[model samples]
Target: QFLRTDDEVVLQCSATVLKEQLKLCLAAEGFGNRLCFLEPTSNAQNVPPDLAICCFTLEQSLSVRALQEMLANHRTLLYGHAILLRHAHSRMYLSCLTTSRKLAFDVGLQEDATGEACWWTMHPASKQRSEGEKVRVGDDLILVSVSSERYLHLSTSGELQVDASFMQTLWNMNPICSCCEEGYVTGGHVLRLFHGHMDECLTISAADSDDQRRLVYYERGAVCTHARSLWRLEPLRISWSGSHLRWGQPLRIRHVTTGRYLALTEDQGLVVVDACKAHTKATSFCFRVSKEKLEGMGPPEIKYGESLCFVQHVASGLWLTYALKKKAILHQEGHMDDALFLTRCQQEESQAARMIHSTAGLYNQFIKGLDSFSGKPRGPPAGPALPIEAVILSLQDLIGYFEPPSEELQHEEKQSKLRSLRNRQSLFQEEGMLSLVLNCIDRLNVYTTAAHFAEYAGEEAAESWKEIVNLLYELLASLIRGNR
Candidate 1:
C-alpha cells in the first residue's frame, strides 16, 4: 500500500489509464522537442519509454534543507505537492523549454533544469488533497507548471503542450511492482481462508452430511462475519525454532469456536475429528505456495494472512479442496487443489487460454495487407499499400493468441502451422514488417481504450472487446519478443 523510493510507476491519462480504448501513457522518446508526450502502449523496454517512471525527491541534506525552506517537512510527495519529474533512464527533467514564445509553451525534457522550470505541482482532479497526505496508487492527478502556471496538457494528436484550461491535463499514477515479494507469516496467528474462484470464506457446518463415520463437511461462510469463520494456525514441529512460517512448513489449522483440529480421513474426507491429540498425523497440513507466487521476485516468505497458498495433507499427500460439483469441501488429489488465501481477517476483493478459430481468415488478411505495400520499403510506402489502418487491425487481432508466446509456438500441432504463417518466407522477410507491427501496437491503443469503456455497447460486447485487447497485448508481446 505504501509507495516507496525507486518504485516504478506508470502515469496514464486519468480518464483512460486501463480503459479498453485510447489508453495513453506519458512516454519519453530519447530527445526532441516532443521528448515528453502521451502514447497508447505501456512497454518500458521499447525504443521510446512508456509513461511509467521512477521518481525522486531531493535525497541529500542540502536539498532537503532547501525543500524545508519551502515548507516541506519530509521527502514524501503528497498530493497537491510540487516535485520535479526526471527521466529515470536519461537523467533529464521534464521542463517547458521556451518560456518566451507566446503561441504555445513547449513542454519537453531539459538537463540541469531544477528550479521552477521543472517543478510541477500535482493536484487531485476531483477532491481537495490536504498537504502531507500520501498520493496513493490510483489517484487522478493534474500537473501544473509552477513557472508558467499552466496545466501540462497532451493534445489528442500527441503533442506535449501547456494550456490554461484544465481540459486534457489529467493523469493517473499507478505503481508497477513487477511480481515482487511480501512479508512473513508468524506462529500462533489467527486466519481466515478465502477461496480464489468463489470469493467465499472457509467454514464448517454443524450437522453431519454423512452419518456412518460422523463425516463433517466444510462449507463456505456466506456472510463471513460469524465466529465459526475464525481459525488459529499452529506449527506441527516441536521446540519451535523460527518466528515466522517457512515456505513448506508443516502446520495445523484449528477451529477457534469448536476447539477441534481440522483433520483428513484415510478415505479422503474432511472431518474435525479430534482436539486433544495434537500429535495426530491426521491434523498435519503443510503450505504449498501458489505457482505464481513461487515465480515472483525475491525469497518465498508468506505474508501472514496475505499471500495465497495451497493447503496439503501430509499423510495422504492430497490437497484440501472445495468441490463445487458435489457441494462439499474435502481432501483430494494434488491437481484439484484450490488455492487458499490465509489472512487474519476477510480481505477486500482485488480485481484464459482459448484457440483462435478465426485465425484462418485473420492470417489471410495480414498476408493481404503485407502484399498491398509496394516494392520500395525503406521509407513510407507511396501507394498500393493496404491502408496502414486496416493492416494494423489484422495485426492487433492476431496478437491475442501470443500472450504466452512460447507455448503458442511450442505446440507441435499448431507450431508448424504458426511457423509456416510467419516463417522465413513472406512474413517477417517483408521489408517493412517490423515498422508495420510497431504502428499496429500504437493504433491498438485506441482500440484498447474503446474496449475498456465500451459498456455503452452493453456488457457482452464490452467483455469480448476486452478479451480482444488482452489478446492484442499477447500478439504485441509475441511480435516484440520475436523482433528482439
Candidate 2:
C-alpha cells in the first residue's frame, strides 16, 4: 500500500510540473501542509491519481451583511435597467411591487449590484393597522377602496363641538306681473356666506318699511281689467280729459319731474299734466298750419306749402301768424270769391303779418299776457278796432287787388213804336242767397274763434284782431257800395 495521511507533509518532486502541482495542493489546503496521497490500485485501470482525487468541496451560504449588499446591488441594477425602459412601463412595475408583498418579502439568493437590502415582516399586519402612510414628494402610489357604508372624521388642533341652539331665519321672495302672461323671477332661497371673528352673535335684520298710503285721488269707472284700478287714489271728480282717460288707448300716468306727471298712451298723443292742478282742466293750446291770401290775389309760387299758424279765437276771425301766403292751396278747390270770403281771408292774413312788424303787434300782445300773469289769463276785454288801412293797403299791394270791369250803360229808346204792335217779353231770375248766407255764416264762425284767441293774448294782439275786424267792416262797406 502506498497510502499516506499526515497533518504536515512536504513532498519534493523532481520536475517543474511537480512544483506547480504541489503549489496547487497547498493552496487547496488553505495554504497549509495538510496533505494525503494515495497510490492507485490495479483496478483503477490507469486513471491518473490527480484525476481520481476530488480537488476540493466546501458548502457555502451568504452572510446577512453580504445578502443585504447583494439586495442593494440588485435594486440598483433593476433601477438602472428600468430607467432605460419607457416611463409608463417602469411605473407599472413599481406600482405592482409597492402593492404586493410577495416580491418584496421573498428571500433572494442573488446579490443585487447596488447593495440594497430587502425587508421582510414575520407577522404582517393589516394596512389599517400600519402607520398611516402619507404621500411622499416623489411617490406615485394612490389608495382606493369600496364599501357599502363609509364614514369620514376630521380632527382640528382646537376644540371641536356642534351647537344646535342657534335660531335659523328663512325668507321667500317672488315677482308677479299681471300686464303680460310671462313674467320674470330673480331671487330665491338666497344664502349668504361670511367669515369673521365669532365671539358673539351676528344678527341680520330686515330693511325699513315703505310708505303704504292709499292713493285715494285716482279712482275711476272700470273699462278694462278690475286689476286696473284707477290711477291710485286720484280724485274721482277730476277732469276726465285731463285724467287717466285715453283718447285711443288706455292712459298710463308716470311720475314726472318735481311738479308734473306725464300722461301717455300707446296710440294717442302724450300730455304732461300739472301735478299742482291735478283735478283742474289743463288748458292746452295747439296749432295747425293754415294758408290765407295776402290779399284778394291768386296763388303765388312762393306760397306753396307756405302756412300761417293760427289759434281758435272766440271772435269773428283767427289769431294768425304775422306773415301769411297770398293764396292757400288748401282752399284751391272752393274757388270762393265772395266779399265775405275775401274779408275773412284778408283779416286772417293781416293778423298773421302783423306778427313780423317792428311792433310785432300780435306777438307783443301774447308776450304781455304771458309776462303779466305768468302765462295764465282770463277771457275777453273790451277794445276798439285798430286803424289798419295802411297795413291793409300794403298787404293788398303785396297780393295785388282785384280790378272792376269798365263799361258804359245805355238807355232803351222807342224809335220803332210804329212797327210791331203786339210784341211782349218777360224775364225771370233764380238767386243763391240762402247758400251764400249759409257760407257766410260758416266763415264768420271760424273768424270769430280766431279773433277771440288773438284778443285774449293781449292789447297788441287785440289790436291785430281790431285791424282784422276793421278790414272786414271796410270790405262789407265796399261790397254794399258796389252792389248798389
Candidate 3:
C-alpha cells in the first residue's frame, strides 16, 4: 500500500528514491517480443492483441528541456584537450581539486561528480602568444592544475592558482611516474586510455590480472636503463590504407571471465543455441577498428543510426548486432545500442609496421629510411666508398678526375644541378662531407633510380658525372685552403 500507484509512476522519475520503486511495466507494443506487456494488475489482462503502446524505461536517457539546467552544471564535463591523471592500478583521470581531492579507483564513476574531475583545458601566461604561444611539445608546459575560472583554453599547461594568473606560477608540474624517476616527457609517453576508460598501457607483472601485462622495464642493451624505463607513447590513432588490411583479419572477440560467444542455428528456429559450434564466422565473428566507413553510412534509401559510425565488420557486412535482441535481421531501427566497440589490440598496428618495413624497407621513405637498416641500397655493385676524410680523401676513388675550377665560377650562372653543385662547392670550399659527394651520385643516377641528378640530366651526359664529382671535392679542399 505504501508503494506508488499507476498514475504516480511519472512522479517516481523526478522524486528522490528511498528504496526500489516498481512501476506498471509494459511491453512496448509494435516493439514485439519479450517486451510487450507492462501495467497495473488490471491493465495487464486487457492487453490489445495487435500490439501498440508507449511506456518509457531507459535509465541513462534525459530530456532536453529538463536537462538544460542540469547540463549547464556539466558544461565542462566533455572530453577534449585534457590531462590523464593515472591511479595506482593505472586507471586514468583528471582529479577534481575539489573539497575532496579524491582520485579513487572505484565503481561509482561520475555519479555525484559530474565527471568534471576528468575534463580540462590548457592555457598559458601572458594572454597574447608572443614567444610562440601554443601548448605544443617543448614550450615548457608541464602541469595539470586549474581554477573554477573565468577562462577556457583548448590546450593548456593545466596548473593554475586561485585568481592567480595561469601563465605564471602554476605550470610545469610533472607528475612522478610510478616506474621512473623523471617526469613523463610530452613527446615521450601518452596514457592510452584502454577499455574506453578502464585502464592504460601497463608494464605490470602479475598483480591483479593473471596474464601480467609487460611486467618488466626496457633493457637498453646488455644494460637495461631500468631506472629510466618508462611507459612509451603511442600514436593516438593508427590507420592503414584499405590496401593494408588485406592481411588476414582476425575474428573472435574476447571478454573478461567471458560473456563467451554462442551460436544459434535456425534449422531449429529460435530454439536452444550452443557455444559448441564449429570455429567459423557462422559461429563467431571478427571485428576490427577500421578507418573505412560502412555501406550503411550513406545509403540514400535505408536510414537511421546516422550519427554516422559503426565498428566495421572486419570481414564484411553480413551482420548481427547485440541491440537487435536475438532478431538476426538487420538495422531494425537502432544505432546507439547496436554499435560495437573497436577495442585496442596489442598486435594489429605493430603488425602493420612490421609488414611495411619487411616489404619496402629502406628506399620507401625519408627520415625513416635514413634510420632503418632497410635504407641501405642493395643494388649498384659497390660504388667508390663514401666520404671518410675531408673532400679529396673521401672522393679519392669516385672522382675519376680532379679540378677545383681554376677561377671561382661566376655566381651569375642560371640554375642547374651541376652548376648548383659547383656553386655550393664555392661557398665554404673547405669542410665538406663525402655525404654531399654521395648526394650528387644519388641525384645523377649512377642507375640507382634514386639518384636524383641522373633522373633529371639523363645518363649524366656520360663524362659530366666524374667532372662534377671531382669539382665538388676539389671545391672542398680549395675552400679550406682559401679560408686558411
Candidate 4:
C-alpha cells in the first residue's frame, strides 16, 4: 500500500478550443495518494505545455462526461490506457478519473438498482502502474467490468450474466480459478467452478457468436478438467427493470457457463442437465410453494408438481420433464450449482457466497460440443429460427468473408460485414467465410488439408504447405437442422 492525501488535484483540458468543466484525476508525486478532483489548471506552469493525451479541440467544449467515455472506449480496444492510484504499482478496477473532476464509485446503469459497479482507476500514476497490474490466470479477484460496472453473478438459475448489482444478496461467488492442471495459469487457463465439492467441478461454456462472451454451466470431461478448453470472463454493468423471481415456481436452473436454462432429459424422469436454450415447453418447471407456512426450518424443498402454478415439458405424445436446483445461495460446498448462487442478502452473508461461484466463473469451459459454431443460442429465436441447412447452403456465399482481414477492408467495413453475418444461421459468423471455403475443399470438413488448404499456411493465403477442413462428416447422417 502507498501513503496518502485527499487534496483536490487540478487539471485543464489543454485544447486550443478553450474548454470548461474539465475533470481530471492526477497526483503530484507521480505515485502517491491519487488525490482526485475536477480542475485546478496548471502545466509547464502555464508557461509551457507538457505531456498531454487527446489533441482534438471542440467548438462547444465537450462536457465533463464525454472525456470519461473517450478514455473508456480506448482502454476497451486494448490500447490498454487506464489511470492508476492508491499504489505506485497498481491499476484499480473500481475507481476512475472522471470528467466530473472527482473520483467516485465507477458505476454502470448508475440509476438502476440491478446494475453493478467498481473502483475507477486514477492518477499521475503512470500508464506504468496499470501495466503492472494485469490479471494473471490464477489471481483471486472479483471481475469488475473494465468497460462498465457489472460484476459477474452466477445465479441459482444456472446462468452467468453481467446483470447483477454489486450488492445483490441471493447467491455466492467462488474464487473462480484458472484451469491449469500443472502450475499457475501463466500460459493457458481454462475456467471452472468448484468449491471443494468433492469431485464435482462445474464448468462454464459458450453458446454462439453473440454469446461468445457470456458463460454458462456445463460439464467437461477429464481432458478439459486437466486444462483443455476455452471461454473467457470480462465484466461491465447494466440495469434492467422487470420480473425477478417467485416462490413455489420451481427455481430456474441456469448453467453459468453457457447462460442457458436447465431442462428435463429425454428419459422424462431425469433432468437433461445438458443444453436446452429454447425457453418453451422444454424449459419450465415447478417447486415447493411455501406450504403450511413453515416455522424455523427455512424454505421448503420438494413439493408436489401437480399443485403448483406451472409450465412443464409434457410431450403431448409421450413423457414429461421439469428442472430445479435450489436457493438465492452462496457456497464453498453444495451439489446444486457449486456456490454460484445466493439469497436476498446482508453484507456478511454476501461475503460467504463467493466460495463456489467465483471459482466456477474463473475456470469453467466456455464452449462445448464440436465446432465453435456449435455454441448454442441464448434463447429460442424471437421471430423466425434459421435452419441449420440454411447455414450450410449459405456457406457458399460466404467465401469472400474470410480473406485474412485484408488491408483494403477498413475496421468499420469489417465490422459491418461481421454484423451483417451475425444474425444468419451460418457458422461463417464465427469461423469466417474464407475458412469455411477452405474446409469445403474436403466436402465441408474443417480439418482435411490437401490443396484447398491453409491452416498450415496460417493467417494469410500463404501456406506452410501442410495441415487442416470439412464441416466434418461424422454428424451428417443423423444430423437435423439446428436453429441459430
lDDT of 1 by residue, 358-398 (tens): 22223345445434431333313333333333333444534
In TM-score terms, candidate 4 sits at 0.22
| RMSD score of candidate 3 (Å) | 28.5
For model 2, residues 305-383, the per-residue Cα lDDT tens digits are 1222232111112221111012111112232221110001122222221112212232233333334433344464333
TM-score of 2: 0.13
Query: Looking at model 1, which ten-residue stretch has the lowest summed lDDT?
Result: 348-357
Q: What is the lDDT of residue 273 in candidate 2?
A: 40
Error of 4 at 359 (Å): 18
Question: What lDDT would each prediction earn against the true structure?
Answer: 0.48, 0.21, 0.25, 0.25
Order of candidate numbers by TM-score, starting with the best:
1, 4, 3, 2
- Per-residue accuracy of model 3 over 1-484 as CA lDDT, tens digit each: 1111111111000111246332221222110011112222112111211111121211221222333454477111111123322221111222333432112121111213244443334444344323223232112232223333322111112421121123222222111111222221111121121111222211222112342221221112311111111122211111110011111233222111111222223453111122234233333333223333440011122111112223222233433332200222222232443332222222222222222222121112221322232224432312332221222222332132123333455545423434433533332122123344344435433443335433333332333445545555453354333211
In terms of lDDT, the best-performing candidate is 1
The model with the greatest TM-score is: 1
Q: Which stretches of candidate 3 lie over 4 Å from their true place?
A: 1-70, 73-90, 99-117, 127-134, 141-484
Where does candidate 2 stray beyond 4 Å? Answer: 1-455, 479-484
lDDT against true structure, model 4:
0.25
TM-score of each: 0.33, 0.13, 0.17, 0.22
